Each structure stands twice: as C-alpha cells, then as structure tokens.
C-alpha cells in the first residue's frame, strides 16, 4: 500500500465501501436535439452523452422553426463517482450532476 | 459484517460521503411516479410516464398524427446488499424515463 492514505475503524467522516463487479427520437422530435460526447477519465461513468436542442423554437408540420413554441432540455439529476486527487482506491466521492437527456416542446 | 482488510481483495472502492414545470407545459406532457427502494441510493427515483399516446396541439387537444414518446437514461445507483452494512454496497445501472418528447411517426 505505497502512496495511498488509510481509514480508521471509527469510519468518520462516514464512508461506504463498494464491491467492484466480477433510437431515432432525437431526429423525429418537434424539439430535435444533437448528442455531444462528455468524457472525464476520473469519473464513472467516464462517458456521458449530453443533449443539446437544435433550435430555440420547435418545428411545425411543414418542418419550419416557429418561435411561439420553445425547445427545452429535459434534465435529469444522475449519480456519478469521482476519483478525486490524490487518485487512490479510497479517494472516491459521490456527485450528482444535471444532464440533458433530450429536448421537449413547451408553451412559454 | 465483513472487514476492510488492508489487502482490499476482492477489490473495492471507498467513497467519502458528502456534508450537504416542463412536464405540464410540454406538447408531450408527462406524469412523474415515485419509485422507492429502501436498499438503494438514491432510495427515491421519479420515473416519467407520458400522459397520452399522442401529442397536444395549440388548442390543447390530443391529435394522433404526432406521438408522445418517453426519453430514457441509464443511471448509476448503489445497492446496499445483504448483510446490510456500510461496506456491503454494489454498483448497478438502471434504465429510467426522465420525460416525454413529441415525434412524427
């Protein structure tokens, strides 16, 4: 165990020990979106695909952008693990981040 | 309840615990339903369910030429496994509907 701290029986501050193991809608939607790849190699999941609405408005039946209706991102709070500095098996932290999964169409 | 031997085998991670509208206005509106599991973190997950099979026009009626569809997300949860100790957690991934969007069939 060189380079990486240690915890006491006490378990204070509180810790958990985690056992390690072993679609077209974005295009057809009235509030269409692009997916953008977010990568953080110290985060689990390392890779998160985040939505970004194509336009400020929504798309009518003739395929035009009308500004009476708004494209808005549907956001989700999700859990991630972050391996914090100094980057040890015991340096992890839980985090909750807000990510856009897609876009929906709303009356202002 | 097990023990953190120095060994750390089988491998674990130790995780430091922290000191801490659109659903109604959408053309594909949704209800939120409460999912609670008292051995999971987050214990409570709010899952979307689209109000109708169709979308809602500007006069507020349900027209069936356009479809309300659920947008899904794979998310991380911790499950506290038996025997239910601070050191008995396991990572898991579940698919949950976050909301609904409006699509041309």
């Amino acid at each position: 165990n060189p380079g990486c701290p240690n915890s006491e029986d006490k378990n204070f501050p509180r810790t958990v020990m985690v056992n390690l193991n072993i679609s077209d809608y974005y295009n057809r939607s009235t509030s269409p979106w692009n997916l953008h790849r977010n990568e953080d190699p110290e985060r689990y999941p390392s890779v998160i695909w985040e939505a970004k609405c194509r336009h400020l408005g929504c798309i009518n039946a003739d395929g035009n952008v009308d500004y009476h209706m708004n494209s808005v991102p549907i956001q989700q709070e999700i859990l991630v693990l972050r391996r914090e500095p100094p980057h040890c098996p015991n340096s992890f932290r839980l985090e909750k981040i807000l990510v856009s999964v897609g876009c929906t169409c709303v009356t202002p | 309840c097990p023990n953190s031997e120095d060994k750390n085998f089988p491998r674990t991670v130790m995780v430091n615990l922290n000191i801490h509208d659109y659903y109604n206005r959408s053309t594909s509106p949704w209800n939120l339903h409460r999912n609670e599991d008292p051995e999971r973190y987050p214990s409570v997950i709010w899952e979307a369910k689209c109000r109708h099979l169709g979308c809602i026009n500007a006069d507020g009626n349900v027209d069936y030429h356009m479809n309300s569809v659920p947008i899904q997300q794979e998310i991380l949860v911790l499950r506290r496994e038996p025997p239910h100790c601070p050191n008995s957690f396991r990572l898991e991934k579940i698919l949950v509907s976050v909301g609904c969007t409006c699509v041309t069939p």
């Epitope: 390690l20 072993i22 | 060994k7 750390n8 991670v13």
Partner: antibody, heavy 119, light 108 residues
C-alpha cells in the same frame, strides 16, 4: 535489502519433477505473498501460483493446479515450487516474486531459475 | 479470466523517440494495471503500478495512463538502456494475467 534468492539451473527429462527454492530476506516473511511466474523462450510471462507463508493459503492458475505445489517454511524464510510431470513446454525461466496485494504487483523478483526439460 | 490485449508485439525506434504501447482488458479493471520491463538476461522489473504510479527509482521518461478497459504506457525519450520487453498485467482479479508483450529495439 528486500531480496529473493533462488536455487540453480535445472535440466530434467520429460515425466520428471523439479523443485525450485526461493529464499526471502529483508522483510517480514509471513505477511507477504510470494508468487511464481515463468518466461518461456522468446516472449511471454505467465503466472503459476502464490503462497502466503504465514497461513499457508495458496492460489494457483487452473492450468497448474494439481501439478504445481507450493510450500513455505517460516523457520527458514524459504518457499518452494514443485512442478511434476514435466513436458518440453515447461522449459522456461522460473521466477519467484513478492506480491503486495493492495495493488497486485510483483515488486521484488528473484534472479530466475532456468529449467530445461529435454529428452 | 480477464484477457489482456497488448499492441504492438514488437517495435523499433530511434534514440530519443516517443514510444507508445497499448493494453486493453476484456472488462473494467479500475486502474489495476501494472507494467513490467524485462531487459535481455535480467529478471522482470516493476516500472509502473496502478496505471500511472512510478515504482521507486524508475526514470520519469516512463509513464502510464488510461481508465476502464484501455491503458497506455509511454516512453517519452527512448534510451539505449530501455531495450527490453515490456508487459502489462491486471491486478484486478484472479488469475493474474498479462498482455503478450512488446519487444522494444533501437534503430540506429
């Protein structure tokens, strides 16, 4: 000063056995795992098994179970790998190496023992 | 078993070049990836442990990086003393498995 010293080169016929010794110094012998890894000619390392001298607990690669036996003697700070029913393909340099478990690395290695299995 | 794919199996490069070797595991190994060096006529030597940490005394021209299933080993400036075979090894779960090796040589 953490150090592992192995017995000398061996030449054996197919079907024979070989027993290689690994003498540890410079650390608390009972509390670290010692492993055996071999290098067959040309390229390639391969893990054989490991022993914790303190308890006598062992772990073997499935390929070698029943054919390789590891033992340890706390009174002499020595571990032994015995490999039976030797075949030509067992020709290799055999190493012992200490295996701190937290990261699962072999940090100190013996000098190697050349085992030639030839008819 | 966790299968380790190491590439390439061999290579040659000039003094002072940058060499990159890859190692890929068949499942997430949580940064438990070590790198060994075996110079001709010598015992293997631990160079890097836990993906990126340098064993005591190892030159800093050697480094490692990666996460999940995908790892790299890099020699920043190849020196003549660096002619050797390099191996990766996962230390995540039994049995301990190795990549197939990369034999490194010097072009003059």
């Amino acid at each position: 000063q953490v150090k592992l010293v192995q017995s000398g080169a061996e030449v054996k016929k197919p079907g024979a056995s070989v027993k290689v010794s690994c003498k540890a110094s410079g650390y608390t012998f009972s509390s670290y795992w010692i492993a055996w890894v071999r290098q067959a000619p040309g390229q390639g390392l391969e893990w054989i098994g490991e022993i914790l001298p303190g308890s006598g607990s062992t772990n073997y690669a499935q390929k070698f179970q029943g054919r390789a036996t590891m033992t340890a003697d706390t009174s002499t700070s020595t571990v032994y790998m015995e490999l039976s029913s030797l075949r030509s393909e067992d020709t290799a340099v055999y190493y012992c190496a200490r295996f701190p478990y937290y990261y699962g690395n072999w940090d100190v290695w013996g000098q190697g023992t050349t085992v030639t299995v030839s008819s | 078993d966790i299968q380790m794919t190491q590439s390439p199996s061999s290579l040659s490069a000039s003094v002072g070049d940058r060499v990159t070797i890859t190692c890929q595991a068949s499942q997430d190994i949580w940064w438990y990836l070590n790198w060994y060096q075996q110079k001709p006529g010598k015992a293997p030597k631990l160079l890097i442990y836990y993906t990126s940490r340098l064993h005591s005394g190892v030159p800093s021209r050697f480094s490692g990086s990666g996460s999940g299933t995908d790892y790299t080993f890099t020699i920043s400036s190849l020196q003549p003393e660096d002619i050797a075979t390099y191996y990766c090894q996962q230390g995540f779960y039994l049995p301990w498995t190795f990549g197939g090796g990369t034999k490194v040589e010097i072009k003059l």
